[PDB]
Design a binder for this molecule. Structure first.
Ligand SMILES: CC(C)(COP(=O)(O)OP(=O)(O)OC[C@H]1O[C@@H](n2cnc3c(N)ncnc32)[C@H](O)[C@@H]1OP(=O)(O)O)[C@H](O)C(=O)NCCC(=O)NCCS
Ligand SMILES: CC(C)(COP(=O)(O)OP(=O)(O)OC[C@H]1O[C@@H](n2cnc3c(N)ncnc32)[C@H](O)[C@@H]1OP(=O)(O)O)[C@H](O)C(=O)NCCC(=O)NCCS
Ligand SMILES: CC(C)(COP(=O)(O)OP(=O)(O)OC[C@H]1O[C@@H](n2cnc3c(N)ncnc32)[C@H](O)[C@@H]1OP(=O)(O)O)[C@H](O)C(=O)NCCC(=O)NCCS
Ligand SMILES: CC(=O)N[C@H]1[C@H]([C@H](O)[C@H](O)CO)O[C@@](O)(C(=O)O)C[C@@H]1O
Ligand SMILES: *[C@@H]1O[C@H](CO)[C@@H](O)[C@H](O)[C@H]1NC(C)=O
Ligand SMILES: *[C@@H]1O[C@H](CO)[C@@H](O)[C@H](O)[C@H]1NC(C)=O
Ligand SMILES: *[C@H]1O[C@H](CO)[C@@H](O)[C@H](O)[C@H]1NC(C)=O
Lengths: 531, 531, 531
């Protein structure tokens, strides 16, 4: 008989799924609501509790994914999914759901560690269902929870004031964690041992929650994979008023006052807000006009509720959750995936510095390098060789360092300096599950670690013995971290803590410890951005 | 001067109306709100208390009737009204009102028994104003209250889950009873002696309230006239999701999720939902396609709030309050009115068993008889004789027994076996107030008892002397039941209690007691349905 | 390869279909446009010539049926179709199409007689595709053409003046005939020998075309089956402005002037006008209010273009240039189908005269009998018997006589006295293809002859030798009439011409001539209506 669990708001019916090598079937629950559908007047407001239900709710079908560009969303899902076949998902404003994968025998009491995944997608696209927690849950005996949160306009529209503070998507993540605290024990999980992990915008979300007083007792370990609160493209600093007005005008709304704009946008249909999203061209590199006025994403803002100050200031006052924190990046963060998705204008293979400077200026929204500083930045990375082909690869390294590498090390250093256990890694491997459209030379591209973390080798076909072992090792490290706040364990390479010696783990075919990740880069950039 | 009464929410102004034969004029109050208008966000949600008003509210005009097919509603009103002239009513979603007829002298303190009427109409049409309480009030010295409740989509739309549980119309009936308990004393009524009564869908509603915990202390006597919770066509069993989706699609709504459907439907205009209602062609026998898929009514469901389980489960569970209960039926419940209203195919008047079986299959939504059982059921009723004209008559008896006769006796037996006082009657009389298009041979058609219960002979012109005595006797029985929970009285024929001897009263030109109502019919159907 | 024919407007591709027993394949062409789609400004205007197309138009799919109540239209199609399985059709205002079934060898020059079918449906519903001309075409070697024309509001809305004369549906029928004349030769048909035939409203349409100057020289023989221009329910006399205003108001249009109502109605969407149709409750006996205000149909009006005066006036004038005309009726025109479709109130069997008179008054829109004349009419038909069951049978005969019987004979007599060949028949047979809901005792019900005329026994299953022979005979009579304007032929029962002896053919299991059809009834009614 299928598994039936009693939650605070009512009973839920899931399904058993067996994985080769494990006797105990994994209980899976899909589409459990953790908040009230943010429809009508609830749009652009904090999430409210879900209404209780009578009888048994069927939790065996995948929930819709929050409204987003349908094509872009399906593409990212197909590129990141760890399951054999990508499942098509429907769009809906009614998307505050979470999926649960528990390997615990529900007929007995269990208090397994809980790993709550927050998906990436630039806060504009993505879905929880893209990630199958079956393999991780079974292999490491942890309860895996995938959550969804409002995206794009619905999750991050901000007027910069009290009429629409913003960060609705982050408040949804907090609401999901609150639900986990109040209900996860019913699924064999330990509410006292919750780890939050995410990649890209998901990693940024983890970083933000670490800095938020609203997430105080909702987690005990954090993992940010390729993305932190210092990844500037995802955090809006300064006056956010101009963007709110552009969105309102594009939707056909007056901009008389903030309250007027929000009231008008609240009357728009889902389709109308989706059409506004498309006209805005989010997540695409605008090669026209002043680079400084382009906004490829709607994201995190300093609202005063979730975040009281900028991430940089919160780090200085060392005011944030000092729980164990693992921060990592991939060898080639800007190697293919991101530039492909953003229609980046790079297609030759050989790049001259003159062209590089022009491209770097157009990339302002991604790297925010004043035009007066472009020459230095470019000469610094490309000036050491006239091999136009090598200049091109060094150019991609430059973007990667500014977006993920440097921000990640700075975040880790500040966390370490607050006295909290810290760990770092650099992932370098090319999964066989890579897209056929991606050249073989790209190793450790954005998102490549996902196939290891979610045990893709055990759900998809064609993985080599090497890739299989890499996944087993990565999952064991992550799960050891989830239960102990330290990834180390018997039979695993030693992973030094990120202390004053700045040790970190180089993960790949040949996994080994090293020290001083991106040291010279942090020095260079911190100095350049100070000018 | 006009009658002015103080209610919890404010003062109300009524009007005096005298009925010859009685010196004390009857105070009449029309359109008193008992809940907040279920508009906008309140559509598909439980009734909220009415807001208080200042000064004196003029209760001298008939309130609108809840949105419904206007042609069908006006036709039913003209066919069932007990007044000289049918009163044309306006349609509106703002329809949660009740009318009061009190014979008490408001200058003194009175605690007369209260009779609350719940009108019928398949939960799709109907109105309170159709029934004038003047005669009953004045003749039997009881306070008569006629209530309205949401109908059709507005009153019963259900997604099968927490986003729209359903039974909004029944919740309104409960709300009206709560209002009576809190305010009726001001109108000379005794909140400690409330009798709920109704016929057809109204009778089914009374039966439902008897089974609902939400109304446990809201009434002390109950009367179900031609309709109970076991009248299957009014109660939906199993998954109600398909019907919800069909309605949403017809209204031009997406069916992505339950929350999405309800939200879209809450956005539709009253006119848009009325057009959806008309396109669904409710309350009409569908002769095309599979009979098992037709839905003539939107009604009661097992929501978890009003009903925690099916009436059958509750009955066996003996989980219902034991108030005195009068349950009755008419000699020919399916004799003319219902078949006429539902457009039943019966032009020829004759009927061979082959045609009979086909019609019975098409009547699946009304009788729910599996196709493989049709021959047995048909042979049972028509196989006794030839003369296709007689067979068609037995065919109408078959439908009547399945929809009203058997369900009523079964409910009566269960109530009796719970230790509660129970009474039964079979009304067999043809009122002169019947439609002119109705054959003189139809006696005791559905609704025929209403003219006697509401004293039409004293409000309408041209009643026969025999009809006048019949009404006086019927009102006496009903009013006696209201005050003592026993219909018996001086000058009235003896009405036996429905005990193990199963005595009941045959009401008509000649009124006398009898025993074992529908005994054999119940045995036959219980067994046939047991297969 | 598939058959390809060259028409005035372009090439068309059909399909070859072979009927059992006939080696010459029938070339079938479905959905050939004979007019420009009556959309936008073309609504409520005369049909315009179809626009020519390049290359080859694929005419292999059934065209949509003109906008109409979809449930009513689907039901009728199922009840009248001669094919094995009913073909579900789409609704559309783009419906001016015709289907062609030609048994001619297109590789050779042929000039076969052409029979053009005009479907019935009260001018409110119906479709051409319901009728498969395969059997008729193959068995009698005639080209069968089934046409469509605008229905309901779209085909007959009239303001009574030049802003919307009306009869758009009849103008469509005329345009189809004009198309046949200009194109049929290419399909092996003789434009010099066209026979128009139709049943019910289609029969009335044929009758109207015989009386219209617009249709002269467009056909050479006519057949009206159960319907003529004197069937008053289909012809509106007097002022039609009141009905136009009711339709405009229901549709939410102002009634300031005729030009304004029409302009507004033309701006409504197809769905809005269909909703108006549903709200109007057409084709249903209105049991409410004054029966003289009822309007169950939107039909023929005296526009001044199609009809210059009432059919009654045109008959005397002997203006209608002559052509051979066959006029027929069925034994029980009001036996089951029509009463069933119109929701006629006849649940019970037997009927008393008092009730009969009330029903006859409510039937005013169908029979047009002044209230002071109801007693006489009723006594004439029912006053000769006490058995109320028979009074019910006789009552149905009365309605049938006033609607079809008398009007048909009067038309035949007038045609005869105009000098043209005239023939009459009375069909008395119960098709095995009848609906299972129709009592076995109904014989010669409205539409019963259709199955014989269209060779249902050769397409559907179950037909007995007797039913098969009847169809062969009927198709033979019909085709001979189309060939020679005289149905008689070798091996067929003698069919006398309808002359001063008023001979007519009684068609059924036993077919033979007789004389003076409805003679006594015509005298009675002519005298009664003269009062
Ligand atoms: C491309 C992506 C960024 C989505 O973008 P988006 O929400 O659709 O917004 P965009 O402005 O980029 O729209 C681009 C348009 O280009 C066109 N296009 C063509 N080929 C395309 C491709 N391969 N990828 C994306 N867009 C494409 C489409 O017409 C699309 O228009 P649409 O709105 O009608 O679907 C990507 O699919 C995303 O899902 N991946 C995750 C990115 C995340 O990791 N970044 C974090 C910080 S960099
Ligand atoms: C017929 C009745 C069921 C109302 O139905 P409804 O809400 O209009 O829905 P329907 O699908 O039946 O509509 C039928 C259509 O048929 C046509 N019609 C023809 N003759 C009719 C008739 N005698 N009565 C009703 N409708 C008729 C109308 O055009 C109507 O169209 P509309 O929707 O534009 O008004 C009835 O009038 C009702 O008011 N009486 C009480 C029934 C109750 O006792 N039954 C409880 C369970 S058996
Ligand atoms: C019934 C018929 C007249 C169609 O009517 P209509 O265009 O739907 O308009 P109506 O007012 O009759 O609608 C009646 C309603 O009653 C209900 N109904 C129930 N049983 C029914 C039945 N057996 N037949 C017809 N309607 C029925 C339906 O809910 C229908 O609802 P809808 O309007 O939303 O579809 C018939 O189907 C027609 O197609 N046949 C041709 C009749 C023609 O030969 N007669 C000419 C002389 S009058
Ligand atoms: C599909 C479509 O648009 N419907 C049309 C079809 C298509 O030609 C065929 O289906 C091939 O696509 O047939 C017609 O063109 C035709 O018979 O003349 C009319 C019809 O409206
Ligand atoms: C639960 O939902 C699934 C997916 O729609 C369905 O297949 C299954 O039958 C449902 N179980 C029940 C009966 O609730
Ligand atoms: C013609 O239309 C039919 C529609 O069923 C289609 O199957 C066919 O491919 C089309 N082309 C031709 C002319 O064969
Ligand atoms: C309230 O309205 C009624 C209805 O017209 C009217 O008769 C009455 O006088 C009004 N109230 C007063 C007394 O002003």
């Amino acid at each position: 008989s299928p598994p039936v669990v009693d939650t605070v708001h009512g009973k839920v019916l899931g399904k058993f799924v067996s994985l080769e090598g494990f006797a105990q079937p994994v209980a899976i629950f899909l589409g459990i609501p953790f908040a009230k559908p943010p429809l009508g007047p609830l749009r652009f407001t904090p999430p409210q509790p879900a209404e209780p239900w009578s009888f048994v709710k069927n939790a065996t079908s995948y929930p819709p994914m929050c409204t987003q560009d349908p094509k872009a969303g399906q593409l990212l899902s197909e590129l990141f999914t760890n399951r054999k076949e990508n499942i098509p998902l429907k769009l809906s404003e009614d998307c505050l759901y979470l999926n649960i994968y528990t390997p615990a025998d529900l007929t007995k009491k269990n208090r397994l560690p809980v790993m709550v995944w927050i998906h990436g997608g630039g806060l504009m696209v993505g879905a929880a269902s893209t990630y199958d927690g079956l393999a991780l849950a079974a292999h490491e005996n942890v309860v895996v929870v995938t959550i969804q949160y409002r995206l794009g306009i619905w999750g991050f529209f901000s007027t910069g004031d009290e009429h629409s503070r913003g960060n609705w998507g982050h408040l949804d993540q907090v609401a999901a964690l609150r639900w986990v605290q109040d209900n996860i024990a019913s699924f064999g999980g330990n509410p006292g041992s919750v780890t939050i992990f995410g990649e890209s915008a998901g990693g940024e979300s983890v970083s933000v929650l670490v800095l938020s007083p609203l997430a105080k007792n909702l987690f005990h370990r954090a993992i940010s994979e390729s993305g932190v609160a210092l990844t500037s493209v995802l955090v809006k600093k300064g006056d956010v008023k101009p963007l709110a007005e552009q969105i309102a005008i594009t939707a056909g709304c007056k901009t008389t006052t903030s309250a007027v704009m929000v009231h008008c946008l609240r009357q728009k249909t889902e389709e109308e807000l989706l059409e506004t999203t498309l006209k805005m061209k989010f997540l695409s590199l605008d090669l026209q006009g002043d680079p400084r006025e382009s906004q490829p994403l709607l994201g995190t803002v300093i609202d005063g509720m979730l975040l009281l100050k900028t991430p940089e200031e919160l780090q200085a006052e060392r005011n944030f959750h000092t729980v164990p924190y693992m921060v990592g990046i991939n060898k080639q963060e800007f190697g293919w995936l991101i530039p492909m998705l953003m229609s980046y204008p790079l297609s030759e293979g050989q790049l001259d510095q003159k062209t590089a400077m022009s491209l770097l200026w157009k990339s302002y929204p991604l790297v925010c390098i004043a035009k007066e500083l472009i020459p230095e930045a470019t000469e610094k990375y490309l000036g050491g060789t006239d091999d136009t082909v090598k200049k091109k690869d060094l150019f991609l390294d430059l973007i990667a360092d500014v977006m993920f590498g440097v921000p990640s090390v700075i975040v880790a250093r500040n966390h370490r300096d607050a006295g909290a256990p810290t760990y770092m890694y650099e992932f370098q491997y090319r999964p066989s599950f890579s897209s056929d459209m991606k050249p073989k030379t790209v190793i450790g591209d954005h998102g490549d670690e996902l196939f290891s973390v979610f045990g893709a080798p055990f759900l998809k076909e064609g993985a080599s013995e090497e890739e299989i072992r890499l996944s087993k090792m990565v999952m064991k490290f992550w799960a050891n971290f989830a239960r102990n706040g330290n990834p180390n364990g018997e039979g695993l390479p030693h992973w030094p803590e990120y202390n004053q010696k700045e040790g970190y783990l180089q993960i790949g075919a040949n996994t080994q410890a090293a020290q001083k990740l991106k040291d010279k880069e942090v020095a260079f950039w911190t100095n350049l951005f100070a000018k």
